[PDB]
Amino acid sequence: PLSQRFERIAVQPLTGVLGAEITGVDLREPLDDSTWNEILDAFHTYQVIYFPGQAITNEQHIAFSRRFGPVDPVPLLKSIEGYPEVQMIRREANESGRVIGDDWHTDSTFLDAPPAAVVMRAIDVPEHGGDTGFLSMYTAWETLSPTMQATIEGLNVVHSATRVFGSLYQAQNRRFSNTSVKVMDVDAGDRETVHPLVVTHPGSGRKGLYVNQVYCQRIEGMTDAESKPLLQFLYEHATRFDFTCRVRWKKDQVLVWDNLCTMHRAVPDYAGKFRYLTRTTVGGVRPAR
Amino acid sequence: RFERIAVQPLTGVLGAEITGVDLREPLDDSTWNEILDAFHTYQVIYFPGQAITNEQHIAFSRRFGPVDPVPLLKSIEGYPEVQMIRREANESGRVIGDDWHTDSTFLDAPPAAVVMRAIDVPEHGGDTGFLSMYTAWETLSPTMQATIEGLNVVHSATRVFGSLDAGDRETVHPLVVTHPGSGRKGLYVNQVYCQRIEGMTDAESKPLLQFLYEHATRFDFTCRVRWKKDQVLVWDNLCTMHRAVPDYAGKFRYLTRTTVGGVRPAR
Ligand SMILES: C[C@@H](Oc1ccc(Cl)cc1Cl)C(=O)O
Numbered sequence: 001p002l003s004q005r006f007e008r009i010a011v012q013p014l015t016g017v018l019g020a021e022i023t024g025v026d027l028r029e030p031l032d033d034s035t036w037n038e039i040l041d042a043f044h045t046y047q048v049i050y051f052p053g054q055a056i057t058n059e060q061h062i063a064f065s066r067r068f069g070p071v072d073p074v075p076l077l078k079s080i081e082g083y084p085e086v087q088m089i090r091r092e093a094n095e096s097g098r099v100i101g102d103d104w105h106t107d108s109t110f111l112d113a114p115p116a117a118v119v120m121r122a123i124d125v126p127e128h129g130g131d132t133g134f135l136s137m138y139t140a141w142e143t144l145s146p147t148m149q150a151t152i153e154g155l156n157v158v159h160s161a162t163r164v165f166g167s168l169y170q171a172q173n174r175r176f177s178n179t180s181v182k183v184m185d186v187d188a189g190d191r192e193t194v195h196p197l198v199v200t201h202p203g204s205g206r207k208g209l210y211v212n213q214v215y216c217q218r219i220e221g222m223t224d225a226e227s228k229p230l231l232q233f234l235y236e237h238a239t240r241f242d243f244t245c246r247v248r249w250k251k252d253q254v255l256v257w258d259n260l261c262t263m264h265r266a267v268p269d270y271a272g273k274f275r276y277l278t279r280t281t282v283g284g285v286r287p288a289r
Numbered sequence: 290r291f292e293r294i295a296v297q298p299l300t301g302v303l304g305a306e307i308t309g310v311d312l313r314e315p316l317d318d319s320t321w322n323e324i325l326d327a328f329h330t331y332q333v334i335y336f337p338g339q340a341i342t343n344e345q346h347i348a349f350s351r352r353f354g355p356v357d358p359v360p361l362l363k364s365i366e367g368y369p370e371v372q373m374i375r376r377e378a379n380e381s382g383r384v385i386g387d388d389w390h391t392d393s394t395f396l397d398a399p400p401a402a403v404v405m406r407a408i409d410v411p412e413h414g415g416d417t418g419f420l421s422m423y424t425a426w427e428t429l430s431p432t433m434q435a436t437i438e439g440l441n442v443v444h445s446a447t448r449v450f451g452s453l454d455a456g457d458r459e460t461v462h463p464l465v466v467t468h469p470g471s472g473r474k475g476l477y478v479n480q481v482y483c484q485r486i487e488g489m490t491d492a493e494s495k496p497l498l499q500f501l502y503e504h505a506t507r508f509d510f511t512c513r514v515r516w517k518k519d520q521v522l523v524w525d526n527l528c529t530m531h532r533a534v535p536d537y538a539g540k541f542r543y544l545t546r547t548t549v550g551g552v553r554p555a556r
């Protein structure tokens with residue numbers, strides 16, 4: 001049982017698939033080795049973990065994030081004054097632009113080495129509205145038939161940011177506001193990189209599906225017509241409701257998600273209400289089979 | 290080659306018109322061999338002006354293999370082997386074969402070929418479409434080819450004459466088959482008889498089969514044959530698909546056909 005396996009923290013799973021609430025620890029302070037190792041174990045098992053009631057400073061947020069790996073801010077988001085490492089998911093009450101992250105994805109997979117994790121901190125969130133969905137790409141992979149696994153396990157996939165800040169974004173109407181999003185070079189938006197469709201997580205050693213509808217363009221080697229259906233099936237499969245969990249925010253909730261083996265999604269159900277979280281990004285290494 | 294027959298290809302994909310031969314007569318070795326060469330190359334071949342009897346029709350068909358009638362068609366009186374594709378002028382409803390398919394793939398060994406003979410056909414209307422599954426396979430990307438070449442597909446007749454017992458019987462064929470005569474690889478799927486990719490769930494299988502149906506039936510993989518009375522046509526039932534065209538309402542249309550038996554589709 002969790003109560004006896006964990007001696008320094010308390011772990012309460014959110015679903016039978018992923019997600020867990022962690023209590024019994026003070027993120028204002030340096031973590032001792034035994035406490036950190038339990039958090040890291042829970043992180044690898046539950047893939048998204050969150051800590052209610054952690055009223056921390058920007059420096060403490062950064063220090064906690066550093067336990068997971070080096071900081072490596074994502075390219076698109078603005079930072080707060082004085083802290084380049086601390087980026088903003090901020091939406092003013094009156095804004096009407098596109099909501100950041102409102103499609104299932106994982107972050108910045110157009111990079112040669114996308115983030116390994118993100119540590120998000122709620123600053124000011126609505127009493128209701130603005131939950132975040134998560135899902136497990138371990139589960140998505142593990143629930144494919146043996147025949148479908150054999151069929152796709154050796155494929156590679158082309159990623160780019162073209163629909164977020166490259167040529168395709170610039171040729172359409174739904175735009176982000178300047179509250180949290182920077183102006184970007186279109187050529188950087190169009191730059192392609194190739195990642196495996198199935199990857200091995202370096203911490204857990206487990207295989208997971210690695211495709212997302214925001215940044216994936218096509219299966220490498222295939223035409224668009226050939227790719228379109230396999231990719232669309234995999235998006236529908238991965239985002240099956242029974243592979244998900246739903247996290248509700250409260251002020252001072254600190255959450256870590258695994259940027260390799262989960263996906264996540266914003267929920268734009270709080271029009272007219274201010275919502276502000278900060279986040280630090282933990283750098284990763286090239287996705288690999 | 291072609292010293293004994295004259296061959297005029299219809300498109301750059303498949304189909305050819307053959308002249309300079311009299312199908313009422315027995316074919317010598319050199320002439321038969323050229324016809325078979327043209328058949329393997331062009332996949333659908335047709336001979337205008339061949340006013341052949343029922344017996345000559347059967348005899349020509351036997352050069353391709355054993356004459357083994359498809360299960361569901363009516364035979365003309367006196368000749369079990371010779372079956373009817375007949376529609377009356379006063380007839381309404383929909384037409385036999387009005388979806389892209391190839392014949393009877395629910396069988397463990399579907400027909401190898403069909404020899405069709407126009408008896409009474411409209412001045413215009415009632416063309417037959419054909420397409421090449423060699424070309425369909427060869428135009429898939431190398432990556433898609435590698436991705437699906439090891440898949441097998443479950444066929445059954447449930448939607449033609451089954452529930453939707455012999456109509457519910459399943460058989461499994463390779464998704465990509467090697468032609469036993471030409472040695473060439475072709476795609477082997479069709480929307481009439483294919484049920485699912487073996488081993489996959491419905492959600493996994495449906496989009497992939499649907500893409501392959503869309504790909505194979507791309508217009509640029511097709512040809513279109515117009516009929517005239519006394520035209521004799523042979524199609525390869527393994528490496529082509531075909532489709533009737535119901536654009537002749539009010540007009541009588543009558544063709545006969547013999548069916549040539551095949552062997553198990555093989556990788
Ligand atoms: C910050 C995040 O950027 C986005 C991801 C998905 C979507 Cl739909 C939009 C944005 Cl800005 C990222 O990918 O790093």
Ligand SMILES: O=C(O)CCC(=O)C(=O)O
Nearest residue numbers: 089100101131132265266
């Ligand atoms: O605002 C949220 O709930 C998630 C936004 C998001 O996708 C992100 O911060 O990367």
Ligand SMILES: O=C(O)CCC(=O)C(=O)O
Nearest residue numbers: 374385386416417532533
């Ligand atoms: O009538 C036609 O053009 C073709 C009908 C058909 O599919 C067949 O005879 O197998």
Ligand SMILES: [Mn+2]
Nearest residue numbers: 101106107264
């Ligand atoms: Mn995101």
Ligand SMILES: [Mn+2]
Nearest residue numbers: 386391392531
């Ligand atoms: Mn037919």
